[model samples]
Target: ADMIGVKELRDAFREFDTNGDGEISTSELREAMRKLLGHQVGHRDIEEIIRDVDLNGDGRVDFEEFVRMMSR
Candidate 1:
């Protein structure tokens, strides 16, 4: 796994959380991939990704969940 600084991780969490609502929704994840990866990954694929990391089953990703998944 790559090592990221604390500030960088916080920044990324805030970035993926485009609305700053304290969570990353499915659409937000799609837009995030579109921005960071320069490609459209589609909603279904993004949903599966979210489902994997969404430990709470709330269909959104919070900061700690984001950190653990990103670290992997």
Candidate 2:
């Protein structure tokens, strides 16, 4: 398996957003992470990291938010 790059991470978040709402909710984040890694991440884990990057809490994640979440 190859490590994800910046552009790949951005595109991946876009794909996961589904609604194009600019922020990924806990469910969307979990589903996407599970699909990519074949395991389910806890909601608390998603919330703790995603909430910081989401900024607006619209429930869908953007490229910048996704990057920030992963960088930490």
Candidate 3:
């Protein structure tokens, strides 16, 4: 949302973290999008999203780094 503030952003990150695993995986992202946003996220798109945000190149997204990436 254009008007989304800091709290909402944080909430979103936390919600998307799903299983409370402290990180987001491809499945987590897809589940988050569908459950939270009502849209299905495909595998290719998930990979692309990971490519863009997984800056550390560990092939997975931790909460802190991922939250910051999405915020920016």
Candidate 4:
């Protein structure tokens, strides 16, 4: 298993959470991926990714959910 320090983990979450919102939206995620990875991730792919991490069915990922995903 991989380990992430608390600060690094939150910083990583912030990367996806553009707009300074507490939640992460598909649009923000896609934008982060594009800007950081230069990969044009499609909507369908982004949706699937969100669903996988959106534990509460809120259609977005909160900090706890982000931590859960990274912990895995």
Per-model C-alpha lDDT, please? 0.59, 0.59, 0.56, 0.56
Instruction: List model 2 lDDT by residue over 2-42, tens digit each.
Output: 45545555666778766656666656665665554332656
Worst 10 residues of 3 by lDDT: 30-39
Q: How should the candidates be ordered by TM-score, best one leading? A: 2, 1, 3, 4
* The best candidate in terms of TM-score: 2
* Model 4 alpha-carbon drift over 4 Å, by segment: 1-6, 15-21, 33-58
Candidate 1 structure lDDT: 0.59
Supply the TM-score for candidate 1: 0.46
**How many steric clashes does model 2 contain?**
7
Q: In model 2, where do residues sit more than 4 Å from their true spots? A: 1-8, 39-60
lDDT of 1 by residue, 4-67 (tens): 4445557756777667577876566545644553336465654565567533456666778665
- For candidate 2, the lDDT comes to 0.59
Error (Å) of candidate 3 at residue 12 is: 4.6
Give the alpha carbon lDDT tens digit for every residue of 1-72 in model 3.
665444544665677766757677645654554444332646555456546753344556666665565566
Q: Write one digit per residue (lDDT tens) for candidate 4, span 1-72.
A: 444344554765676665756777655554543444233646565455555644345567666765665454
Question: TM-score per candidate, in order?
Answer: 0.46, 0.47, 0.42, 0.41
Can you give the lDDT of residue 37 in candidate 4?
26
Ranking 1 against 3 by TM-score, winner: 1
Give the TM-score comparing model 4 with the true structure, all chains together.
Answer: 0.41
